[PDB]
mmCIF file of C-alpha atoms and ligand atoms in Angstrom:
data_model
loop_
_atom_site.group_PDB
_atom_site.id
_atom_site.type_symbol
_atom_site.label_atom_id
_atom_site.label_comp_id
_atom_site.label_asym_id
_atom_site.label_seq_id
_atom_site.Cartn_x
_atom_site.Cartn_y
_atom_site.Cartn_z
ATOM 1 C CA UNK A 1 7.484 -9.574 7.186
ATOM 2 C CA UNK A 2 9.046 -12.734 8.590
ATOM 3 C CA UNK A 3 7.699 -14.830 5.655
ATOM 4 C CA UNK A 4 9.308 -12.666 2.920
ATOM 5 C CA UNK A 5 12.253 -14.914 2.010
ATOM 6 C CA UNK A 6 9.858 -17.864 2.115
ATOM 7 C CA UNK A 7 7.713 -16.185 -0.566
ATOM 8 C CA UNK A 8 10.674 -15.682 -2.876
ATOM 9 C CA UNK A 9 12.128 -19.133 -2.240
ATOM 10 C CA UNK A 10 8.857 -20.883 -3.025
ATOM 11 C CA UNK A 11 8.107 -18.933 -6.220
ATOM 12 C CA UNK A 12 11.806 -18.536 -7.166
ATOM 13 C CA UNK A 13 10.882 -14.949 -8.047
ATOM 14 C CA UNK A 14 11.677 -11.562 -6.480
ATOM 15 C CA UNK A 15 8.579 -9.592 -5.379
ATOM 16 C CA UNK A 16 8.452 -5.746 -5.663
ATOM 17 C CA UNK A 17 8.100 -3.440 -2.601
ATOM 18 C CA UNK A 18 4.424 -2.612 -3.437
ATOM 19 C CA UNK A 19 3.622 -6.310 -2.836
ATOM 20 C CA UNK A 20 4.821 -6.123 0.783
ATOM 21 C CA UNK A 21 3.482 -2.627 1.549
ATOM 22 C CA UNK A 22 0.065 -3.663 0.265
ATOM 23 C CA UNK A 23 0.091 -6.665 2.605
ATOM 24 C CA UNK A 24 0.662 -4.328 5.574
ATOM 25 C CA UNK A 25 -2.099 -2.080 4.202
ATOM 26 C CA UNK A 26 -4.548 -5.015 4.189
ATOM 27 C CA UNK A 27 -3.385 -6.180 7.639
ATOM 28 C CA UNK A 28 -4.251 -2.774 9.061
ATOM 29 C CA UNK A 29 -7.571 -2.887 7.206
ATOM 30 C CA UNK A 30 -8.538 -6.293 8.650
ATOM 31 C CA UNK A 31 -5.888 -7.836 10.935
ATOM 32 C CA UNK A 32 -8.029 -10.904 11.623
ATOM 33 C CA UNK A 33 -8.122 -11.878 7.908
ATOM 34 C CA UNK A 34 -5.774 -9.675 5.842
ATOM 35 C CA UNK A 35 -6.150 -11.651 2.618
ATOM 36 C CA UNK A 36 -9.949 -11.221 2.865
ATOM 37 C CA UNK A 37 -9.882 -7.524 3.857
ATOM 38 C CA UNK A 38 -11.210 -6.456 0.417
ATOM 39 C CA UNK A 39 -13.655 -9.334 -0.015
ATOM 40 C CA UNK A 40 -16.898 -7.843 1.349
ATOM 41 C CA UNK A 41 -16.322 -4.415 -0.242
ATOM 42 C CA UNK A 42 -14.683 -5.262 -3.587
ATOM 43 C CA UNK A 43 -15.261 -8.994 -4.020
ATOM 44 C CA UNK A 44 -11.465 -9.390 -4.164
ATOM 45 C CA UNK A 45 -9.210 -11.917 -2.373
ATOM 46 C CA UNK A 46 -5.365 -11.951 -2.050
ATOM 47 C CA UNK A 47 -3.875 -15.302 -3.308
ATOM 48 C CA UNK A 48 -0.658 -16.850 -4.740
ATOM 49 C CA UNK A 49 2.368 -15.328 -2.904
ATOM 50 C CA UNK A 50 -0.063 -13.616 -0.438
ATOM 51 C CA UNK A 51 -1.068 -17.146 0.650
ATOM 52 C CA UNK A 52 2.523 -17.560 1.816
ATOM 53 C CA UNK A 53 2.592 -14.221 3.670
ATOM 54 C CA UNK A 54 -0.645 -15.370 5.304
ATOM 55 C CA UNK A 55 1.054 -18.617 6.398
ATOM 56 C CA UNK A 56 -1.630 -20.666 4.648
ATOM 57 C CA UNK A 57 1.067 -23.011 3.299
ATOM 58 C CA UNK A 58 1.872 -24.335 6.812
ATOM 59 C CA UNK A 59 3.258 -32.118 -3.244
ATOM 60 C CA UNK A 60 3.071 -28.314 -3.406
ATOM 61 C CA UNK A 61 3.969 -26.649 -6.708
ATOM 62 C CA UNK A 62 3.769 -22.872 -6.667
ATOM 63 C CA UNK A 63 4.361 -22.758 -10.437
ATOM 64 C CA UNK A 64 0.729 -23.943 -10.700
ATOM 65 C CA UNK A 65 -0.763 -22.224 -7.652
ATOM 66 C CA UNK A 66 -3.650 -19.979 -8.810
ATOM 67 C CA UNK A 67 -2.311 -20.235 -12.363
ATOM 68 C CA UNK A 68 -5.455 -19.803 -14.469
ATOM 69 C CA UNK A 69 -5.963 -21.445 -17.858
ATOM 70 C CA UNK A 70 -4.555 -18.534 -19.920
ATOM 71 C CA UNK A 71 -1.817 -17.303 -17.543
ATOM 72 C CA UNK A 72 1.482 -17.359 -19.489
ATOM 73 C CA UNK A 73 4.616 -17.977 -17.372
ATOM 74 C CA UNK A 74 5.201 -14.194 -17.227
ATOM 75 C CA UNK A 75 1.946 -13.839 -15.241
ATOM 76 C CA UNK A 76 1.860 -14.483 -11.472
ATOM 77 C CA UNK A 77 -1.604 -14.279 -9.881
ATOM 78 C CA UNK A 78 -1.902 -12.221 -6.700
ATOM 79 C CA UNK A 79 -5.617 -11.351 -6.530
ATOM 80 C CA UNK A 80 -8.843 -13.058 -7.583
ATOM 81 C CA UNK A 81 -12.281 -11.609 -8.106
ATOM 82 C CA UNK A 82 -15.564 -12.816 -9.629
ATOM 83 C CA UNK A 83 -15.315 -16.571 -10.166
ATOM 84 C CA UNK A 84 -18.078 -16.511 -12.807
ATOM 85 C CA UNK A 85 -15.642 -14.721 -15.141
ATOM 86 C CA UNK A 86 -12.457 -15.903 -13.317
ATOM 87 C CA UNK A 87 -11.344 -12.301 -13.040
ATOM 88 C CA UNK A 88 -7.882 -12.111 -11.495
ATOM 89 C CA UNK A 89 -4.816 -9.865 -11.306
ATOM 90 C CA UNK A 90 -1.175 -10.860 -11.562
ATOM 91 C CA UNK A 91 2.280 -9.389 -11.720
ATOM 92 C CA UNK A 92 3.683 -9.496 -15.250
ATOM 93 C CA UNK A 93 7.444 -10.093 -15.622
ATOM 94 C CA UNK A 94 9.238 -10.312 -18.957
ATOM 95 C CA UNK A 95 12.100 -12.216 -17.287
ATOM 96 C CA UNK A 96 12.258 -14.278 -14.076
ATOM 97 C CA UNK A 97 15.334 -12.219 -13.129
ATOM 98 C CA UNK A 98 13.493 -8.875 -13.243
ATOM 99 C CA UNK A 99 10.881 -7.219 -11.113
ATOM 100 C CA UNK A 100 7.352 -7.097 -12.561
ATOM 101 C CA UNK A 101 6.858 -4.443 -15.211
ATOM 102 C CA UNK A 102 3.169 -4.014 -14.265
ATOM 103 C CA UNK A 103 -0.005 -5.613 -12.898
ATOM 104 C CA UNK A 104 -2.127 -7.300 -15.540
ATOM 105 C CA UNK A 105 -5.688 -8.603 -15.350
ATOM 106 C CA UNK A 106 -7.494 -11.401 -17.174
ATOM 107 C CA UNK A 107 -10.915 -13.011 -17.116
ATOM 108 C CA UNK A 108 -10.075 -16.636 -17.855
ATOM 109 C CA UNK A 109 -13.672 -17.692 -18.571
ATOM 110 C CA UNK A 110 -13.893 -15.006 -21.301
ATOM 111 C CA UNK A 111 -10.622 -14.786 -23.264
ATOM 112 C CA UNK A 112 -6.819 -14.914 -23.183
ATOM 113 C CA UNK A 113 -6.347 -11.132 -23.105
ATOM 114 C CA UNK A 114 -4.103 -9.568 -20.448
ATOM 115 C CA UNK A 115 -5.048 -5.945 -19.737
ATOM 116 C CA UNK A 116 -2.608 -3.544 -18.003
ATOM 117 C CA UNK A 117 -3.908 -2.282 -14.670
ATOM 118 C CA UNK A 118 -1.200 -0.011 -13.216
ATOM 119 C CA UNK A 119 2.396 -0.826 -12.370
ATOM 120 C CA UNK A 120 1.793 -1.644 -8.711
ATOM 121 C CA UNK A 121 -0.909 -3.386 -6.728
ATOM 122 C CA UNK A 122 -2.106 -0.176 -5.016
ATOM 123 C CA UNK A 123 -2.940 1.232 -8.477
ATOM 124 C CA UNK A 124 -4.471 -2.065 -9.606
ATOM 125 C CA UNK A 125 -6.928 -2.189 -6.715
ATOM 126 C CA UNK A 126 -7.685 1.555 -6.916
ATOM 127 C CA UNK A 127 -8.502 1.241 -10.621
ATOM 128 C CA UNK A 128 -10.708 -1.773 -9.858
ATOM 129 C CA UNK A 129 -12.418 0.150 -7.061
ATOM 130 C CA UNK A 130 -13.144 3.164 -9.296
ATOM 131 C CA UNK A 131 -14.758 0.877 -11.858
ATOM 132 C CA UNK A 132 -16.676 -1.096 -9.216
ATOM 133 C CA UNK A 133 -18.027 2.106 -7.637
ATOM 134 C CA UNK A 134 -19.767 2.863 -10.968
ATOM 135 C CA UNK A 135 -22.073 -0.138 -10.378
ATOM 136 C CA UNK A 136 -22.981 0.441 -6.691
ATOM 137 C CA UNK A 137 -26.537 1.561 -5.874
ATOM 138 C CA UNK A 138 -26.415 1.270 -2.051
ATOM 139 C CA UNK A 139 -25.415 4.303 0.023
ATOM 140 C CA UNK A 140 -23.583 2.331 2.732
ATOM 141 C CA UNK A 141 -21.491 0.454 0.156
ATOM 142 C CA UNK A 142 -20.822 3.758 -1.634
ATOM 143 C CA UNK A 143 -19.618 5.255 1.653
ATOM 144 C CA UNK A 144 -17.449 2.219 2.383
ATOM 145 C CA UNK A 145 -15.765 2.244 -1.026
ATOM 146 C CA UNK A 146 -15.101 5.989 -0.889
ATOM 147 C CA UNK A 147 -13.370 5.449 2.462
ATOM 148 C CA UNK A 148 -11.244 2.586 1.098
ATOM 149 C CA UNK A 149 -10.491 4.714 -1.975
ATOM 150 C CA UNK A 150 -9.261 7.498 0.323
ATOM 151 C CA UNK A 151 -7.017 5.066 2.240
ATOM 152 C CA UNK A 152 -5.587 3.540 -0.948
ATOM 153 C CA UNK A 153 -4.908 6.974 -2.444
ATOM 154 C CA UNK A 154 -3.166 8.272 0.672
ATOM 155 C CA UNK A 155 -1.072 5.104 1.076
ATOM 156 C CA UNK A 156 -0.018 5.281 -2.579
ATOM 157 C CA UNK A 157 0.761 8.992 -2.213
ATOM 158 C CA UNK A 158 2.912 8.355 0.867
ATOM 159 C CA UNK A 159 4.846 5.560 -0.887
ATOM 160 C CA UNK A 160 5.213 7.461 -4.157
ATOM 161 C CA UNK A 161 3.249 4.992 -6.296
ATOM 162 C CA UNK A 162 1.537 6.153 -9.458
ATOM 163 C CA UNK A 163 -2.173 5.384 -9.699
ATOM 164 C CA UNK A 164 -2.261 5.569 -13.519
ATOM 165 C CA UNK A 165 -3.358 2.592 -15.595
ATOM 166 C CA UNK A 166 -0.267 3.096 -17.797
ATOM 167 C CA UNK A 167 2.812 4.794 -16.377
ATOM 168 C CA UNK A 168 5.854 6.173 -18.187
ATOM 169 C CA UNK A 169 8.006 3.107 -17.479
ATOM 170 C CA UNK A 170 5.138 0.982 -18.857
ATOM 171 C CA UNK A 171 4.915 3.116 -22.011
ATOM 172 C CA UNK A 172 8.701 2.846 -22.202
ATOM 173 C CA UNK A 173 8.568 -0.947 -21.971
ATOM 174 C CA UNK A 174 6.082 -0.987 -24.866
ATOM 175 C CA UNK A 175 8.884 0.500 -26.986
ATOM 176 C CA UNK A 176 10.790 -2.778 -26.470
ATOM 177 C CA UNK A 177 7.845 -5.046 -27.395
ATOM 178 C CA UNK A 178 8.742 -7.029 -30.512
ATOM 179 C CA UNK A 179 5.147 -8.331 -30.971
ATOM 180 C CA UNK A 180 1.861 -8.211 -29.059
ATOM 181 C CA UNK A 181 0.915 -11.949 -29.294
ATOM 182 C CA UNK A 182 -2.686 -13.076 -28.931
ATOM 183 C CA UNK A 183 -2.849 -11.944 -25.309
ATOM 184 C CA UNK A 184 -1.831 -8.387 -26.233
ATOM 185 C CA UNK A 185 0.593 -7.836 -23.337
ATOM 186 C CA UNK A 186 3.666 -8.094 -25.570
ATOM 187 C CA UNK A 187 6.887 -10.097 -25.789
ATOM 188 C CA UNK A 188 10.182 -8.423 -24.866
ATOM 189 C CA UNK A 189 13.336 -10.201 -26.041
ATOM 190 C CA UNK A 190 16.843 -8.819 -26.656
ATOM 191 C CA UNK A 191 17.282 -7.470 -30.193
ATOM 192 C CA UNK A 192 20.654 -6.109 -31.282
ATOM 193 C CA UNK A 193 21.320 -3.324 -33.780
ATOM 194 C CA UNK A 194 21.209 -5.830 -36.680
ATOM 195 C CA UNK A 195 17.681 -7.015 -35.683
ATOM 196 C CA UNK A 196 19.084 -10.300 -34.339
ATOM 197 C CA UNK A 197 16.845 -11.754 -31.623
ATOM 198 C CA UNK A 198 13.464 -11.743 -33.350
ATOM 199 C CA UNK A 199 11.818 -12.352 -36.724
ATOM 200 C CA UNK A 200 8.139 -12.250 -37.610
ATOM 201 C CA UNK A 201 5.779 -15.127 -38.227
ATOM 202 C CA UNK A 202 4.832 -15.617 -41.906
ATOM 203 C CA UNK A 203 1.143 -15.051 -41.078
ATOM 204 C CA UNK A 204 -0.755 -12.200 -39.499
ATOM 205 C CA UNK A 205 -2.491 -12.806 -36.183
ATOM 206 C CA UNK A 206 -5.881 -12.898 -37.912
ATOM 207 C CA UNK A 207 -4.601 -15.458 -40.419
ATOM 208 C CA UNK A 208 -2.907 -17.513 -37.689
ATOM 209 C CA UNK A 209 -6.209 -17.592 -35.782
ATOM 210 C CA UNK A 210 -7.893 -18.789 -38.969
ATOM 211 C CA UNK A 211 -5.312 -21.563 -39.306
ATOM 212 C CA UNK A 212 -5.963 -22.548 -35.670
ATOM 213 C CA UNK A 213 -9.722 -22.542 -36.188
ATOM 214 C CA UNK A 214 -9.469 -24.986 -39.101
ATOM 215 C CA UNK A 215 -7.459 -27.362 -36.908
ATOM 216 C CA UNK A 216 -9.856 -27.417 -33.974
ATOM 217 C CA UNK A 217 -12.895 -27.713 -36.268
ATOM 218 C CA UNK A 218 -11.491 -30.441 -38.525
ATOM 219 C CA UNK A 219 -14.168 -33.051 -39.206
ATOM 220 C CA UNK A 220 -11.797 -36.034 -39.169
ATOM 221 C CA UNK A 221 -8.316 -36.810 -37.915
ATOM 222 C CA UNK A 222 -7.079 -36.956 -41.503
ATOM 223 C CA UNK A 223 -8.352 -33.443 -42.173
ATOM 224 C CA UNK A 224 -6.810 -32.251 -38.895
ATOM 225 C CA UNK A 225 -3.475 -33.705 -39.997
ATOM 226 C CA UNK A 226 -3.727 -31.670 -43.209
ATOM 227 C CA UNK A 227 -4.836 -28.524 -41.344
ATOM 228 C CA UNK A 228 -1.685 -28.880 -39.207
ATOM 229 C CA UNK A 229 0.601 -28.519 -42.259
ATOM 230 C CA UNK A 230 1.053 -24.689 -41.959
ATOM 231 C CA UNK A 231 1.924 -25.098 -38.256
ATOM 232 C CA UNK A 232 4.461 -27.855 -38.990
ATOM 233 C CA UNK A 233 6.025 -25.578 -41.614
ATOM 234 C CA UNK A 234 6.252 -22.630 -39.208
ATOM 235 C CA UNK A 235 7.985 -24.892 -36.676
ATOM 236 C CA UNK A 236 10.636 -25.619 -39.314
ATOM 237 C CA UNK A 237 11.004 -21.856 -39.820
ATOM 238 C CA UNK A 238 11.476 -21.531 -36.048
ATOM 239 C CA UNK A 239 14.318 -24.076 -36.118
ATOM 240 C CA UNK A 240 16.146 -21.941 -38.694
ATOM 241 C CA UNK A 241 15.412 -18.846 -36.607
ATOM 242 C CA UNK A 242 16.857 -20.577 -33.541
ATOM 243 C CA UNK A 243 20.000 -21.451 -35.526
ATOM 244 C CA UNK A 244 20.461 -17.732 -36.258
ATOM 245 C CA UNK A 245 19.627 -16.643 -32.671
ATOM 246 C CA UNK A 246 16.195 -15.143 -33.524
ATOM 247 C CA UNK A 247 14.730 -16.836 -30.447
ATOM 248 C CA UNK A 248 11.678 -14.572 -30.184
ATOM 249 C CA UNK A 249 9.970 -16.136 -33.207
ATOM 250 C CA UNK A 250 9.416 -19.502 -31.554
ATOM 251 C CA UNK A 251 8.386 -17.772 -28.350
ATOM 252 C CA UNK A 252 5.688 -15.887 -30.279
ATOM 253 C CA UNK A 253 4.391 -18.938 -32.164
ATOM 254 C CA UNK A 254 4.264 -21.026 -28.993
ATOM 255 C CA UNK A 255 2.593 -18.216 -27.058
ATOM 256 C CA UNK A 256 -0.101 -17.716 -29.716
ATOM 257 C CA UNK A 257 -0.827 -21.451 -29.796
ATOM 258 C CA UNK A 258 -1.009 -21.517 -25.993
ATOM 259 C CA UNK A 259 -3.302 -18.478 -25.962
ATOM 260 C CA UNK A 260 -5.660 -19.961 -28.535
ATOM 261 C CA UNK A 261 -6.418 -22.470 -25.772
ATOM 262 C CA UNK A 262 -7.047 -25.742 -27.613
ATOM 263 C CA UNK A 263 -5.645 -29.008 -26.249
ATOM 264 C CA UNK A 264 -4.760 -29.790 -29.890
ATOM 265 C CA UNK A 265 -1.834 -27.347 -29.485
ATOM 266 C CA UNK A 266 -0.307 -28.524 -26.175
ATOM 267 C CA UNK A 267 2.186 -30.822 -27.891
ATOM 268 C CA UNK A 268 3.584 -28.218 -30.293
ATOM 269 C CA UNK A 269 3.487 -25.517 -27.607
ATOM 270 C CA UNK A 270 5.444 -27.924 -25.390
ATOM 271 C CA UNK A 271 8.015 -28.183 -28.192
ATOM 272 C CA UNK A 272 8.217 -24.385 -28.739
ATOM 273 C CA UNK A 273 7.947 -22.629 -25.381
ATOM 274 C CA UNK A 274 10.394 -24.579 -23.126
ATOM 275 C CA UNK A 275 13.126 -24.427 -25.781
ATOM 276 C CA UNK A 276 12.569 -20.707 -26.449
ATOM 277 C CA UNK A 277 12.644 -19.819 -22.743
ATOM 278 C CA UNK A 278 15.791 -21.889 -22.240
ATOM 279 C CA UNK A 279 17.530 -20.317 -25.244
ATOM 280 C CA UNK A 280 16.552 -16.923 -23.806
ATOM 281 C CA UNK A 281 17.968 -17.945 -20.376
ATOM 282 C CA UNK A 282 14.521 -17.612 -18.807
ATOM 283 C CA UNK A 283 14.778 -21.112 -17.401
ATOM 284 C CA UNK A 284 12.104 -20.714 -14.724
ATOM 285 C CA UNK A 285 9.508 -19.881 -17.388
ATOM 286 C CA UNK A 286 10.451 -23.094 -19.222
ATOM 287 C CA UNK A 287 9.690 -24.993 -16.001
ATOM 288 C CA UNK A 288 6.356 -23.209 -15.541
ATOM 289 C CA UNK A 289 5.102 -23.814 -19.088
ATOM 290 C CA UNK A 290 6.045 -27.535 -19.038
ATOM 291 C CA UNK A 291 4.239 -28.082 -15.744
ATOM 292 C CA UNK A 292 1.220 -25.985 -16.773
ATOM 293 C CA UNK A 293 0.783 -27.705 -20.139
ATOM 294 C CA UNK A 294 0.979 -31.069 -18.333
ATOM 295 C CA UNK A 295 -1.743 -29.893 -15.889
ATOM 296 C CA UNK A 296 -3.767 -27.134 -17.582
ATOM 297 C CA UNK A 297 -6.758 -27.099 -15.207
ATOM 298 C CA UNK A 298 -9.808 -24.820 -14.682
ATOM 299 C CA UNK A 299 -9.360 -25.306 -10.838
ATOM 300 C CA UNK A 300 -5.903 -24.362 -9.469
ATOM 301 C CA UNK A 301 -5.475 -23.716 -5.709
ATOM 302 C CA UNK A 302 -2.658 -25.976 -4.543
ATOM 303 C CA UNK A 303 -3.855 -25.584 -0.905
ATOM 304 C CA UNK A 304 -7.166 -27.397 -1.592
HETATM 305 NA NA1 NA B 1 1.487 -13.059 -32.741
#
């Protein structure tokens, strides 16, 4: 596609082959409006990089474009669904220098959880379709979805794409996950044979969430200052961890605070996440998190 290098220059990210093949699939499906080809049948719409392939881009910050409230920098939205739940799908990359490891989904009006949904967009839409078909009570819609299901399956078969929700390479990546974080999709950082690269937080996730709850529910600013004391302490622990190259600890603390979702945590998360991503040489993610924390909206299409 003639707009390919424009996609990767604007996002500063490399897109996998499934991204481009799926565009051609949707073009054939509805050449008048490829990004809306699944809208009547599935309630889905292609967005983010697809907007560039569609030429819809012709101040424009693609680090924020269709970035929903709980999308960590690893998560790049490509498809949106029901706006009542803010259902959407995105490629998930552990590093800006790698291809996506899978397609994740989140409902931003419900929670911060990122659910795996295949390792390519053909799988992601097929899995969505299978689930959507369970709700359909109209014979014409049933017929339409079965046809689309047949086309997706054959296209995936011809390209050699798995249609499984979790593939082998995905289950292999989970072996590298040093912690789940609050969103459950996992952090992957380099860890050498002496465990250097990561160390655990002093609190469990349930206890960290309890600490966060006492901060947001503090009845006065003085009580909130006191409720912050365990966070301030953990940030000191992160500084020591950074001095000994255990960069993943501050990444995990910052990610959990971001995922909890309170504006009371934007300042500390802005002190943890940019530094951690820079120390990990994931500089683009440091840019994304800075710009997102400065503009963490519930409306996010940069094309207005
Ligand atoms: Na965690």
